[PDB]
Amino acid sequence: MCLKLNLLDHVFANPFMNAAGVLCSTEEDLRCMTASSSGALVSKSCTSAPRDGNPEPRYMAFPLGSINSMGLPNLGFDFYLKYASDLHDYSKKPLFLSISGLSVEENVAMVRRLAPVAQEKGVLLELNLSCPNVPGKPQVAYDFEAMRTYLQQVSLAYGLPFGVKMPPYFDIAHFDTAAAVLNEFPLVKFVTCVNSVGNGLVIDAESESVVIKPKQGFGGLGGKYILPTALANVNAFYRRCPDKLVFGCGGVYSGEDAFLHILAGASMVQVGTALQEEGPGIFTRLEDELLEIMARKGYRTLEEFRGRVKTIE
Amino acid sequence: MCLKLNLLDHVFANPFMNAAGVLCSTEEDLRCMTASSSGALVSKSCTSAPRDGNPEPRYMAFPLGSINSMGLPNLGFDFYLKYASDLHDYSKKPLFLSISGLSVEENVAMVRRLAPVAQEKGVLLELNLSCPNVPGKPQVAYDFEAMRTYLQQVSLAYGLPFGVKMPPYFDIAHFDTAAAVLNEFPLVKFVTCVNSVGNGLVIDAESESVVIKPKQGFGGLGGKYILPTALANVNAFYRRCPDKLVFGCGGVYSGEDAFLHILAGASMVQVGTALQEEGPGIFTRLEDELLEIMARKGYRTLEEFRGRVKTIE
Ligand SMILES: Cc1cc2nc3c(=O)[nH]c(=O)nc-3n(C[C@H](O)[C@H](O)[C@H](O)COP(=O)(O)O)c2cc1C
Ligand SMILES: Cc1cc2nc3c(=O)[nH]c(=O)nc-3n(C[C@H](O)[C@H](O)[C@H](O)COP(=O)(O)O)c2cc1C
Ligand SMILES: CC(C)(C)OC(=O)N1CCc2cc(CCc3c(C(=O)O)[nH]c(=O)[nH]c3=O)ccc21
Ligand SMILES: CC(C)(C)OC(=O)N1CCc2cc(CCc3c(C(=O)O)[nH]c(=O)[nH]c3=O)ccc21
């Protein structure tokens, strides 16, 4: 029985990794994720310049999940490029570097510089499309013209295999259209579904108040709230993007949730809210739990069930 | 008590009602909701002709909510019109009729027949926008130009105050655009936020199978999964549509949940999944619970806290 994966010309001990933005902002965080039993890690989404992010409180968690409006606090691209180029021990596990520029030009500028490091060290790019562009326009991945522009320019500037982090969609015509855009770009080799469910609002009944300060309390939702949304997205893209990998993210707290992701088509499985809340010890639990479900069912490898979710009639 | 309230020229004993599609399809269902302690009821969304709906199983519930792909099973518009004109006892509580034709023309044909019954008896129209357009296009509310057309045509054909049932949005630019469309129609006097969160996917780990038959297991989500999404939408519309009322729907299981919807801006509060699961006795529990929260806080009216959610700093 084994959790090993080979993909993207890397080897992974298991499919688990942090979701971007969790336990991955500082050198300390990145060393901590490396020391964990995760099969990979991804760095905090970066911008060209360091950022302080939004005013606090900007993250809160609850029994059913979390809400955030972090605002891209990060140490800046040079820091993450350095971590990838000089500090990361690739004999421990593979490294993904997430980028989230606030314009197409900013993304092009970062990927041009990443490319020689990616070629030489094997760091993998995850481009975050579930982000702001022009205020008053939708996030990039909800504006299919902007999305196409971003992927054209990044493909040209990077010239190497990469992946994309996608917001959730809620409408079959949007799945159709989004996957068709992605399928224009052969360098897009993995699709991460999903980023937070956007612009939720948590209200505390005792205080009669929202729980995060930015944006009048509106923020993206993670955790138990979003598992069926995440599974739908992983399967929708798994079905529409047969020459690409799908990584699942959203609502994983247990090996059973991970099992569901993998049945829907996930290769790697990312852990956000549950990791923020429990800490990196979660990875040993998730491994043990997933192996226990496999052993009950007689599955010996991930391939033997990945994408094999059954439909009715 | 009491939680009595007046709007749209009608008087309501309390803010609670069923959500469209729950306990409202048959004469039996409608008489059951009428006999309940709810302050109002709404009929199943109808089409011109009777419909069987999609294959079963098409609804499933779980501790955190529900998933459905019902496919508009209903008795047809002639039935619901007859119920509104001849059968409903308006002395018990107000009635709303939900219309969900599959084209703009179908909606126009139904509203021109409803209009005289609305004038004579006081039935209220809820137009469901969270309904399919042409297949291969997004649902109507997700296509702003189609939405505008629907509303111009209905407004013209109907000529009386009505409301609309909206899908959730997840992007502030979308809230801006959608509210601006609705505000172009002075006959749209109430906005119901929200319909189910679209196209989720629930998988059963033991059977390794999706849990509903239509659409390869994809369906709209209701219940605990969607409460922060519902609150955000209620609040976003409440803020943007100061000359309309907002009706809250999504994730109400308790008077506390209802309390949160009203803080967010809700005038009426609709109950779907929790009503499907608990039955119509839920309305006496919700009233008791809401009045207890009120008494503990010193609130004597809903108007004292409606829309008064506090932001930070
Ligand atoms: C505190 C916080 C920070 C996040 N930062 C980023 C980010 O920098 N880039 C990104 O792609 N996603 C970010 N996300 C989204 C997560 O990567 C993940 O997609 C989302 O939380 C859903 O997974 P979950 O249900 O396991 O939380 C962040 C989430 C949280 C809670
Ligand atoms: C079985 C079922 C049938 C439904 N049918 C309709 C409908 O006919 N028209 C409508 O506007 N919404 C319909 N809905 C959506 C609900 O009215 C409601 O918006 C959604 O379930 C979210 O509320 P909840 O969290 O209380 O379930 C239906 C929901 C369910 C669960
Ligand atoms: C640039 C400006 C307007 C300060 O941005 C923001 O207010 N936000 C709030 C949410 C957000 C998200 C992003 C993308 C990074 C990200 C974040 C994040 O850093 O807040 N949180 C997530 O859950 N997923 C993400 O992909 C960037 C900017 C902003
Ligand atoms: C016309 C056709 C293709 C059979 O429709 C469908 O398969 N569906 C699946 C979901 C759906 C919804 C609607 C709108 C009525 C409705 C339904 C419903 O009847 O399925 N469920 C909800 O959660 N909200 C709704 O607003 C109409 C058609 C369809």
Element (H, E) at B227: helix B227-240
Q: Judged by CB atoms within 8 Å, which residues 255-284 of A form the interface with B?
A: 256, 259-260, 263-264
Tokens of A45: 């989404």
CB B270 within 8 A of CB B233: no
Tokens of B171: 């992007």
Distance CA B21, CA B10 (A): 22
CATH of B1-53+72-196+223-313, one of 3.20.20.70, 3.90.380.10, 3.40.50.1000, 3.40.50.960: 3.20.20.70
CA geometry: angle at A90 spanning A89 and A92, to 5°?
75
Is residue A133 marked as binding? yes
Q: Does A176 touch chain B (CB under 8 A)?
A: yes
Q: Is B24 a catalytic residue?
A: no
Distance CA B294, CA B300 (A): 7
Q: How far apart are the first and last CA of chain A?
A: 31
Q: What technique solved it?
A: X-ray
Q: Does A167 touch chain B (CB under 8 A)?
A: yes
Nominal resolution in Å? 1.8
Q: Kindly give the distance from the C-alpha atom of residue A100 to the centroid of ligand 3, in angstroms, as a whole number.
A: 9
Q: How far apart are the first and last CA of chain B?
A: 35
How is chain B split into domains, by residue range? 1-53+72-196+223-313, 54-71+197-222
CB A277 within 8 A of CB A60: no
Distances (CA, A) of B172 to A132, A142, A199: 11, 11, 7
Other Cβ atoms less than 10 A from the Cβ of B199: the count is: 25
Question: Per CATH, the architecture of A54-71+197-222 is what?
Answer: Roll (2.30)
Distances (CA, A) of A215 to A68, A71, B232: 10, 10, 11
Distances (CA, A) of A65 to B21, B98, B192: 28, 33, 25
* Cα atoms in the Cβ-side hemisphere of radius 13 Å centred on A181: 22
Distance CA A83, CA B232 (A): 38
β-pairing, B95-99 vs B124-128, is: parallel
Pocket of ligand 1 (CB under 6 A): A 19-22, 44-45, 59, 66, 68, 70, 98, 100, 128, 165, 195-196, 222-223, 226, 249-252, 271-274, 276
Distance CA A188, CA A164 (A): 7
- Closest CA in chain B for residue A213: B312
- Which letter does DSSP use for residue A17 in this model? E
Is residue A128 marked as binding? yes
Is residue A272 marked as binding? yes
Q: Phi first, then psi: what are they for B267, rounded to 5°?
A: -95, -55
CB A126 within 8 A of CB A96: yes
